[PDB]
Design a protein around this ligand. Structure first.
Ligand SMILES: O=C(CO)[C@H](O)[C@H](O)COP(=O)(O)O
Ligand SMILES: O=C(CO)[C@H](O)[C@H](O)COP(=O)(O)O
Ligand SMILES: O=C(CO)[C@H](O)[C@H](O)COP(=O)(O)O
Ligand SMILES: O=C(CO)[C@H](O)[C@H](O)COP(=O)(O)O
Lengths: 276, 276, 276, 276
């Protein structure tokens, strides 16, 4: 009384996420927590700015202002200090840990060291670990070594590494920064959007790219940036200020989600924003 | 231009999951992937039976019959063999790995060893590891050592361990089995439902309890068992046969969800089942 | 003067080998050395018999009789002893190492221990490690632990493990043995061909299956066995005696290749054998 | 009924690859994947340039432009980033991993660190690891330490190390750079071809030498360079730009193969190129 359905051979289901078709199950799994398998994109809520800036505007009280935003985000990005202290585990949301630091706004910005062991990243159930790369800055060499070290460590354990291109911001520059990081082994790259040439940054990069929100803009303009980035091949956005510094954070997020996952237009989305 | 809201002191949000209020963030995080933070319960789809039974009825073709069920489950339970081979990572669903084995239906059932290293559990992004405890069986001592070893290893890494009471099935017996496992350190206990006294099993166990589906029953009766268990304090169910051996697996799951998360009645639920 | 071809998005190339679509690059790479990416099959030349049998017939002088066969094989299977001593490295052919032993024909056949460290497997540039599983035998439990240990070790390093079902030989039996091994984590399973029901063994096994040659048969019959096995879904054969005990080894191998990779018929192939 | 052929004593088959006749089996095995045992030479397709140069011309889209070349190459050389992301494991071609980096075209070129752990090299099934040595540059000391560290690590595991002489380019200079690297332990040395004295570079180096393609040349001239190098004792070439920057990459590769493995002349080969 058994049915082995032998008339129908077993076939493998392809894993389509850009440049991640040759990774182990666990690593693909963590990546799938970050990039929605359906759309292949992500809306990432970033609040790690304090790691070298202290209580930056809008992030004075993560526990009050940012707490109510978690549920509306695909993934959270922050440090292990904040994570443990004020992000409730019950939030049940994927996290990407800031794993670099030891710099401040009072000194050389590019002077970063690895800020948490892979050991602890695993203890904290991370989906990924993130560090800055500073191409063209004084501590460029060290910043790349930080990426090398996180990748070496993450491959033992199936933890993805996200390289962030920290900074003249033109296409030829970001092409250089993103490609090197990818080349070194980072599975996710986060960079800035550029007025012209962005398409080339995406095309030249073998792995998923995510754009930073950047300094505060009018909500409508912020949404235009997102639409452009997505339309030109970005795999999602990593917003911080353009959300938590808005008068209507939750509304802004829903708009951003509309644009990223559902191919909404900048205008349509802005009207989704005006209804909240 | 900053607002520290100093008139409103920061307060810790309590973690209410039974007997898990004193664990590290990462472990609480993994637990919150299993047990819905809202309802505090879980509907677990179990298909690990093959680990000592080979191609058991209904599990001949996981890739065909079980594949379409994944999305309707809170968490998946299976071996690392099946996980890698036929469970697509894009399933984006929390997993609990069977971590014991080395036994078969052709020999002593209680003769189990640890079947995967914590190393590989982490590599596979697990939410927990599971192993059998056989109180009263020939290899009782070894089975408990399996639990001891998984907890020792899990605590370094923030991985919860689930102890399963494998087997006369009365209340006094399962009280003994579940309590000992909890006492050794397992964070989740999975046991069988009992006609009378089940409430005492839950009350005597300091951590969350989950019931096994058990042998195939008429759908209506299986739902009654769930309702009873939940009503008497279980934290969810770990169904296998009563789902994948049904003529309407997806329908049955929706029913079981209704009973577990939404306090549906056995009858009402059964009518949810008859509509699909 | 650069062309990023931004009109043409990058797409992942699927890895189609049965149940190996969720493995890291290096492991998929080693598997691709074994299973021809085009056909998805393998012809494996096995000469490890001496590991518990001593100088078995046909394998008295590997250096003389077997040496001239290597080039005609897809992959070699043998022990590290023979590998180092008489297989010339310049053979440039992928190897699968026998990694179990400590038994002999003078004692209990199922009493095997792991016979080489993963350390040394990596040192020898192996494509996989192989060990016996003895379901139903006296040392069944230990044999399965051997597989558990090799998988744990292999996963750290991207080395595949092949589980071999050592032994009444019917379908229900081999279904049990193969499925349990796969379930524990082995990426390759090698078993015996069966008169009836073989299709069910393949269908119930989530990873590639390879058949043993078995005791010497008339060349025409051996080819019929291969044809049946392949036709019913096997991923290749692991011949030993039916090749090296033939009066025309090289001829026989070319036949077997014809059947496995090129869908030749038993008869057509036998005529390929009669021309050499 | 056994034949031990005792009238014919067993004899060791010599391993002839220059200066590798005293290595363990595994290491000789990996070297044999790189240097064809028959000819003793190799045609190596190099596309690692991006590791410090970003999207260099011709390598904007490895996945499109370089993908179709793989099959026509003896061995692939690239970074672990590119390997995992866009080189399909099914390519079934030996790889040599770029294992240095942390420099860029925006800073001191000779400032390289080890870019991937031997751990991960083994995980990726490499045939060798490669790093730059910069004799005469500012970070000369560190670059040599990079070779020392890779050799120490490779010897535990049977992984060969390839030292690359990065840079006035005359014979006395490259003799110094190549000889030092070899002396430290590197089993493969890759250097540049020189108008006069190249023969002395080869003679003075105890292990196999491979030449870099160098900047783009007219196809006919590039082939002349290969012919000279081979004729004067090189063990193969590591082309990049002279292939992927050609209007007929595949044709060019076939030509190069002709010259390296089959002792074709520059002219004859060029006519092989004009027919494709
Ligand atoms: O902290 C940073 C890196 O050092 C980034 O500026 C930040 O994480 C990006 O998010 P946003 O610009 O949208 O606030
Ligand atoms: O495999 C088992 C333990 O050895 C269990 O029987 C199983 O996992 C429980 O699920 P169900 O009884 O609902 O099928
Ligand atoms: O050695 C063995 C396992 O203990 C097998 O019998 C052998 O390797 C299979 O090959 P063949 O039966 O074709 O000779
Ligand atoms: O990348 C390099 C070293 O830093 C080399 O220039 C390169 O790998 C050699 O190949 P080619 O000169 O033929 O392009």
């Amino acid at each position: 009384g058994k049915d082995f359905r032998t008339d129908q051979p077993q076939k493998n289901i392809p894993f389509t996420l850009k440049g991640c078709g040759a990774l182990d199950w666990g690593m693909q799994s963590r990546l799938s927590r970050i990039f929605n398998p359906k759309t292949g994109k992500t809306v990432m809520l970033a609040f790690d700015h304090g790691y070298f800036q202290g209580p930056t505007t809008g992030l004075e009280r993560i526990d009050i202002n940012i707490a109510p935003l978690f549920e509306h985000a695909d993934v959270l990005m922050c440090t292990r200090g904040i994570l443990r202290s004020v992000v409730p585990p019950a939030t049940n949301r994927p996290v990407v840990l800031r794993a670099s630091g030891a710099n401040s706004i009072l000194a050389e910005l590019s002077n970063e060291a690895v800020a948490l062991s892979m050991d602890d990243a695993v203890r904290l159930n991370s989906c990924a670990v993130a560090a800055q790369v500073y191409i063209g800055s004084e501590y460029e060499h060290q910043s790349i070594k930080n990426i090398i070290q996180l990748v070496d460590a993450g491959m033992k354990v199936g933890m993805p590494t996200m390289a962030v291109t920290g900074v003249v911001r033109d296409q030829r520059y970001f092409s250089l920064a993103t490609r090197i990081a990818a080349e070194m082994g980072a599975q996710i790259i986060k960079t800035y959007y550029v007025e012209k040439g962005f398409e080339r940054i995406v095309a030249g990069c073998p792995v998923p790219i995510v754009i930073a929100g950047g300094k505060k803009l009018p909500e409508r303009e912020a949404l235009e940036m997102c639409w452009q980035a997505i339309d030109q091949g970005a795999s999602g956005v990593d917003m911080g200020r353009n959300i938590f510094q808005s008068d209507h954070p939750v509304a802004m997020m829903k708009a951003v989600q509309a644009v990223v996952h559902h191919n909404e237009t900048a205008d349509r989305a802005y009207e989704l924003y005006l209804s909240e």
